[PDB]
Design brief:
Chain B: Component of the large ribosomal subunit. Chain B: Keywords: Acetylation, Cytoplasm, Metal-binding, Phosphoprotein, Ribonucleoprotein, Ribosomal protein, RNA-binding, rRNA-binding, Zinc, Zinc-finger. Chain B: One of its GO terms (molecular function) is structural constituent of ribosome. The structure is cut from a larger assembly and holds chains A and B. By secondary structure, chain A is mainly beta. Helices cover 7% and strands 25% of the residues of chain A. A six-stranded antiparallel sheet of chain A has the order 5-10-6-7-8-9, with no helix packed on it. A four-stranded antiparallel sheet of chain A has the order 3-2-1-4. Chain A has a two-stranded parallel ribbon with strand order 11-12. In chain B, 23% of the residues lie in helices and 5% in strands. A two-stranded antiparallel ribbon of chain B has the order 1-2. By secondary structure, chain B is mainly alpha-helical. Classes of the chains: A mainly beta, B mainly alpha. The chains hardly touch. Bound molecules: zinc ion. The site of zinc ion has 9 residues of chain B, from loops. The structure holds nine RNA strands.
RNA sequence: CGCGACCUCAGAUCAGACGUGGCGACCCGCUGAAUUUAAGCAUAUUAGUCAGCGGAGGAGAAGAAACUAACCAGGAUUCCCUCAGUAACGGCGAGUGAACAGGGAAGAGCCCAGCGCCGAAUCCCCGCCCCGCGGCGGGGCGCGGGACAUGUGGCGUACGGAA
RNA sequence: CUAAGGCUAAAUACCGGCACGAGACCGAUAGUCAACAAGUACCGUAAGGGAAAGUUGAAAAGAACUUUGAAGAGAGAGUUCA
RNA sequence: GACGUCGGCUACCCACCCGACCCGUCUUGAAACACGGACCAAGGAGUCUAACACGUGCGCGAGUCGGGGGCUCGCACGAAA
RNA sequence: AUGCCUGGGCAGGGCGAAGCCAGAGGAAACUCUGGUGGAGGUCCGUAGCGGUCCUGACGUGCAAAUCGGUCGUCCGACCUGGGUAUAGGGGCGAAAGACUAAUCGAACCAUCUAGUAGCUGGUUCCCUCCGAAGUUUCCCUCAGGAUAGCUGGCGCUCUCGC
RNA sequence: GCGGGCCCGGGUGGAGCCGCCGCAGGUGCAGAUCUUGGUGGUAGUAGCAAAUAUUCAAACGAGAACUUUGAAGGCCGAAGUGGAGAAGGGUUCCAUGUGAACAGCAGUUGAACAUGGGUCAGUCGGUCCUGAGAGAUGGGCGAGCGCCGUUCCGAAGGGACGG
RNA sequence: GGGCAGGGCGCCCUGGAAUGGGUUCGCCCCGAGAGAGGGGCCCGUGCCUUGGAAAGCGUCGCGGUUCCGGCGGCGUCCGGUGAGCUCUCGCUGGCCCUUGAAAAUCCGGGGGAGAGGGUGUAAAUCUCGCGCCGGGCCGUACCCAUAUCCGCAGCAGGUCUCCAAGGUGAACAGCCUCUGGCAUGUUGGAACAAUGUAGGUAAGGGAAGUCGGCAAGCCGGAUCCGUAACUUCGGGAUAAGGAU
RNA sequence: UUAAUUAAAACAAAGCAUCGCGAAGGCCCGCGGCGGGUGUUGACGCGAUGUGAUUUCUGCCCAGUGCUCUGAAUGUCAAAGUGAAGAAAUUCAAUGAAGCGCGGGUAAACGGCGGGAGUAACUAUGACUCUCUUAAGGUAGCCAAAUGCCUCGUCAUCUAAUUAGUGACGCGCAUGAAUGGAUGAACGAGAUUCCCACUGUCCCUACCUACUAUCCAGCGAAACCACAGCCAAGGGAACGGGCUUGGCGGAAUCAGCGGGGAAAGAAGACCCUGUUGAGCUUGACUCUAGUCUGGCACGGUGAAGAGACAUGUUUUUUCACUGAC
RNA sequence: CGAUCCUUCUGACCUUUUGGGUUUUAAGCAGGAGGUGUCAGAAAAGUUACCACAGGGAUAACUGGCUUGUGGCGGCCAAGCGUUCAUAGCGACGUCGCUUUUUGAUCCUUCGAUGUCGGCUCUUCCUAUCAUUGUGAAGCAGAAUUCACCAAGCGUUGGAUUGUUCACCCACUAAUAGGGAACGUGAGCUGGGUUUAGACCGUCGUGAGACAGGUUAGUUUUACCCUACUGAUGAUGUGUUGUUGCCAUGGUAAUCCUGCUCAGUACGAGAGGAACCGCAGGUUCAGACAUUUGGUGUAUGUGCUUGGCUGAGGAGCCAAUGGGG
RNA sequence: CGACUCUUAGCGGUGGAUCACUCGGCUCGUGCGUCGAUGAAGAACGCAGCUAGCUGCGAGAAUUAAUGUGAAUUGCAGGACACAUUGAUCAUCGACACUUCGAACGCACUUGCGGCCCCGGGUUCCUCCCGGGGCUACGCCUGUCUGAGCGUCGCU
């Protein structure tokens, strides 16, 4: 009957992210001649808190070697980074915490964060709150490397793309229980309108396939094929095994 | 509550006077008339509202130019001449 | 290391003109249902219809066969009678449904590309003189410009044409 | 017959626009919603909805003037064939 | 029997005797404890087109026809004839 | 109804968490006593917000949902003005099929539309003559049709108290 | 005249109407919770009972319980029945005059009616800026009205100092 | 505007401190320089001064038939206070899996690209003190709510804010009063019948009425004692129960 | 939280456990686009669910319906391509993708978790034993519960009396373990039982006050209305104001009153019919967005290799380049 | 055992296949088959308690109508019970009736609506008589007792449980007899549970949903019209008024029990145990009245007090009746 | 005979029914068959001595000019006119004029901010300021001017 909840999130205008107070996109420095051949030095001016993000950000000031200007970047602060610290970026940068260098140069077993899944995308992998990627082994031929992601998947990546040494600052955030409806409400108010979740079983049979009936029961198997039309695909999406 | 109590708080208006048709239809938020479609170049009209179409037609207004056009056509659409003087 | 032609491509409050919108009874090009009928209802019917969009005129569209016919043949298009509620279509049910010929209203035929012949013989714009200028034309004088040979103009088009 | 190019009035249609003629049509609850300051008054935020409402008298000759009452209202008088 | 007397069946009012339940409709069955109904004035519902079938009237008659068009008028009567 | 932006507001009291001070005991670990502190989606409670009970008043009312008493909450998932975004098989919903301009299990206006009804209701002057049936069979037929039957009208072919 | 109906007499009325032979129709009302309009019983009835409260004297005035003045008694008891605003209304604001109509009694009163008057800004705000957001050009889609998008497939600054 | 009280400083100088010191309601600070002295800066909305007593107010008395925004005498003074109410400023803390806005506009700083006259003058004055001219357009009344808005209305409904006196009182609770506002909320008079609506009171019993303690009633503030079962050890709790 | 009958045991909530996704991605919007939301985002994230503080646990079952995994070891398998005879339309043959069949996993997926007999030195119950059956046959717990027809179950307490309340029993029509079981400090305008105090709820009503109701001055409606209104019996269409037989009846009214007018209201909400509909569901009949797969075109260059036909053709497998994208 | 349309087979030297000719193909004529079991022949799963519309009293859930199977009640015969003895009291095997206070059957009135159970209050009526008055009978010695007759005048209670009708228990009493009046009584009341919409549990269904299976919260509108009734002015006649009175007619009212004496008597082996007339009084009901007791109390009568206000004393007022004797 | 009530009749009340009128509709037919960037349709605001509405008009605002006709308009005054004079009113209308939005055009819609030229006040171009006048919207056609290209080329 009605359009079920979840379909209406795609259109937006209610479920859109609250991004007014956010400090901006957390991207690595753009690849250029300095980072490609040598290294560029920047100063960690300050560390700031990004609303709706567990990890704190760090403003780093570099100097552009083409015009008399000082560039500013919003890196994702690795754990241990402090203000008044020099960070070095590039192929010749030393292997220290808070230094973004290509994963090809760094040795095996290196722990990195804000990894670039593709060369030049300014860092996309393992950058949530405390997650980190592990460099497993390098393949000098074909210029490829193996990376263990926080989810446990091993991905083949290019050696050209860069990564920041160290884990992301702010680990152990999920250890503390929320303990309140209010804490969760304030957490999700800074992110999006998705916190109050109503069970489809408790819903009417017109706003959710699981609704209806004189008893609160699903009635049909929760596991559903992933090749199902929107509106019906609800519950466990293409579950392989559903047990404990 | 939904009735007399709710009718009390009708404090702010949504429609204003349109500057193309003169009706109080120009919607402030959408910036659209809904009676003539002011932001749209073309006048809004539909065949399913015959009475609404006849309310504002060519003959409804002054026709300050159309009447003189009709008179000029009737007399021959002539220009640049005067009747014989006394 | 620049300049000078050409091909593609931009800027102009460059000089001169053009379109926008409205009405929409009639017309043209699209999109386009359901009430209704079938004693239900799904193909059908309502129906290329209502609604929606775009485009002009005093009319518009169509129009001079890649036609109709099988006859001793007719000969652009449009409208009326008839063909005819016929051939034909359809859960061959409800229902839908032309065309040819014949008699009238009117009646008008034509033009390019190509093929080819002619010195681009062609066309547009700006200056001067004469006529006239309130739907800006005609002639003459301009080593004044432009378009055109990646094709303008005259002859010429299926009824043959050119020399 | 000669497609993949083009032009063309005539007989054709016209519930809109300008100006006319006509009626075995209705005659103010009828005929257009609208015979009259009608798409007017009015209603709804809006798309939109939408009325009721003609008649003194030939001629205002529309009752001068006296009188009761604060006045509305009367009683006389007068105009008019009425 | 003829200046306060005659005839007026019908219509005005009253009295008496008998009879007599409120109309329309559905229904086998309505006065119904079935439904509509305060009263009055105006309006108000089997029309028109087309296709048939039957019967009747008229004209012609193995014939019949006016559909459409044309000839007479500037249309009063005529968009008739 | 929800999301966002920009502003405003929320007396007086109770409980007395972290932290800190002093005293006493101890061999240490540390522990008791008296204070300071004012945290809490803390309690009573006003403004504000909402509407449990009397199934009170009224119930052609003050009111197409109001009034009295008693009520829950009142520092946080709080209340609220303005601007803005989501438009109808759509929106939104701490989820009641709740709200979407006094209408919501599909808003409002106009048109198709004088949509269809085997079902209700109604169906307009007089007199005269004739005058019925609820039965046959068939139909997804049982509140209806068709078909015979009952009926009326138009006649026509003949016989005759001639 | 069985009847539908019709012919005379009287009163009002003042300008058109009818009989017969034929034709034509939007042609006859008691009902349809019929449409429009008007009028009755109810009925001088229900009612003019939410938030404590008025009294005396005088003035104007034809007219006084409701107006004004003076005095007395009261209430709202500074989160007020006080003084100013925002949205909204648009002359409701002021003075004079009237009591035709409204203020569910009345009124000499009113926010009623009729006449006239009233809003004075560099400093108070709009105007300026941007927020959530809306919306052109470029580009793409779309039969089409238009839609998608606000930096995205752009030759995107017509600005400035010095020479 | 000038000056000074009064606050704040994460500002400087001398000096180096355990016998630890300074200090707040709490905190907190110190060899990365505490206490003790001398200074510096910011706000100074407060006090004095120009404005400014000329004007305003409270009184006493006159000019003027009347119009008349008049004329004059004086006063506008001295002190203390408070967890007192409101506003503002400044420190100090606690909370966030909340971190709590953009732009217009203005200013400061690094540099010397460039200018100046050459020994009495000049370029410059992010102009030091004056002097001259202009600032255009729109709204400006009133109501802002038991009668000026929306609910068919002069409707017990709804509608966003500022100002917030005295007494009692914990209190912006309720009640009484001052400034201010009004005639009791679309009418008055006469009696006080029955039904009612809203308040009360009742001998004895105390829920025996009723589906049901529905309704009403009981307790209620403060001070001093006391406070169980259970428990997540936080609570229960103003438990319960006593005296004033 | 249902504005306007339901403020609740309902919703939500932190806590707990699953599922998809490493970006040419997961979910979703969109007629359309190199479109858009999550996303100013990256597994401690986003999206979809179930249960719903703490403690103690979370038993067995994949037979059924789902979901998911690989798999030329393959039955079915459309279009396109290939071969065949025919004059051709053609039909036949081979080949043959995804999906269905075939094989595993998954129940904190949907869900489910039995019936007969014999048997212990009085009886009784019954350890224990036998047979038939499924994918296991309900485990720990709990209850005559908000869940129990019999039923007002049996026993004890609470009363003088209790279908109510509380504590134990399991025989449970038809309790039960994240369709979550048991417990549980604090709290609840949630539903019930008892006790103390309290009182007009009552015994049993009485009195007082204010505002109406009453009357008057002024102003003044509305619903409803076949005609109107006294009863007993009879018949009637089966309960009469009218009819029949009797009883009887007397102007105009005031304040109450609720027996009657089968009183007023809404063309009954219930039931049925209609070949009238709408909301919702699916193992109903036709379909459709979306999604997966196969074929043709955009779609090229180079290098090798193999099968088949045949004595050059097709299928082409793999590896490289970018010039399309 | 089967119409149209469609398919398939058979037959003709069968017709057409359109400008003519040939051959495939196709369309034709005739005769069979494939099937419509709802069988004169639609292609077709559910739910709605969120519901909607046109109608039906043709058709259900109320009452009232005919009948009385069933329920209740009463007779006829007599084999027997009754120590002997059928009829003191009963009565089998059979049989005849009465009632609509139970459930049944029919659908006659009502679906343009007759408000659907109980309880409270209130009036009247019936006897199929529980008790009281008057009597008959015994297996009646007294007491106690059942059976029957005239007989409805007066009575038929207070409570625990349950919404209950019904049902059981406690206590008192003469007795706690049975029923009707639209299963009396919702413009009289309550809404407790049937019976809207929100929810919880168990069973059933894949599902939406269903449950004479349980639980909780869930708006009870209007009289001023006519009649009936309670009261109040009144009304036609008596010439007008006043007086004191009569009376037809209606209504009707009192009821029951305890103690003393009789009397520990009659009777009786004993145990036990009366009755008539008298005296004192009580239950319920009816009509009044306030001397006393109690209640109310705003004579707002008189003191006492909290907050505030007239400067204070005095005298006062405000705080919807300030509170309290 | 009273009051009230029922019927009929006369007159008088509410009501506007019937009839008779009609500067209005409906239908058919004929001719013409015409809008706009030189600014359309429509809308807003103003214009009369007394003027609210309708109609008419656009700061030249109940109408200007010209032609035709020839003594009025009128609800009242004022009156212009000598009606032997282009001369009152009317019709025609060919000249002039035509405020603000609106395809609406400098950007937006507040009636706010501007740019490039000219003129006047101010000035003695001296830039401000004030007022007035003309341009400044998109797409597109021809031509002109200025430009870009590691596109194709020939000389140095
Ligand atoms: Zn408009």
């Amino acid at each position: 009957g009605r359009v079920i909840r979840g379909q209406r999130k795609g259109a937006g205008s209610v479920f859109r992210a609250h991004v007014k107070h956010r400090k901006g996109a957390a991207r690595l420095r753009a690849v250029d001649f300095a980072e490609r051949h040598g290294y560029i030095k920047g100063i960690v001016k300050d560390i700031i808190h990004d609303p709706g993000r567990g990890a704190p950000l760090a403003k780093v000031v570099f100097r552009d070697p083409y015009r008399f200007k000082k560039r500013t970047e919003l890196f994702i602060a690795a754990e241990g980074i402090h203000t008044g610290q020099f960070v070095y970026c590039g192929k010749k940068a030393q292997l220290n915490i808070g230094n973004v260098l290509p994963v090809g140069t760094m040795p095996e077993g290196t722990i990195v964060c804000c990894l670039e899944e593709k060369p030049g995308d300014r860092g996309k992998l393992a950058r949530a709150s405390g997650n980190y990627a592990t460099v497993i082994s390098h393949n000098p031929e074909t210029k490829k490397t193996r990376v263990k992601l926080p989810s446990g998947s091993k991905k083949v990546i290019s050696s050209a793309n860069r990564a920041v040494v160290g884990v992301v600052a702010g680990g152990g955030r999920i250890d503390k229980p929320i303990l309140k409806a209010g804490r969760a409400y304030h957490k999700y108010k800074a992110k999006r309108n998705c916190w109050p979740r109503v069970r489809g079983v408790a819903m009417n049979p017109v706003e959710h396939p699981f609704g209806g009936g004189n008893h609160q029961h699903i009635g049909k198997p929760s596991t559903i094929r992933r090749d199902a039309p929107a509106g019906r695909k609800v519950g466990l999406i293409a579950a392989r095994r559903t047990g404990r | 509550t939904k009735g007399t109590s709710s009718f009390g708080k009708r404090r702010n208006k949504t429609h204003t006077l349109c500057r193309r048709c003169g009706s109080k239809a120009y919607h402030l938020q959408k910036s659209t008339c809904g009676k003539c479609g002011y932001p749209a170049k073309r006048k809004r009209k539909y065949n399913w509202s015959a009475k609404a179409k006849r309310r504002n037609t060519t003959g409804t207004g002054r026709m300050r130019h159309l009447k003189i056009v009709y008179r000029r056509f009737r007399h021959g659409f002539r220009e640049g001449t005067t009747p014989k003087p006394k």
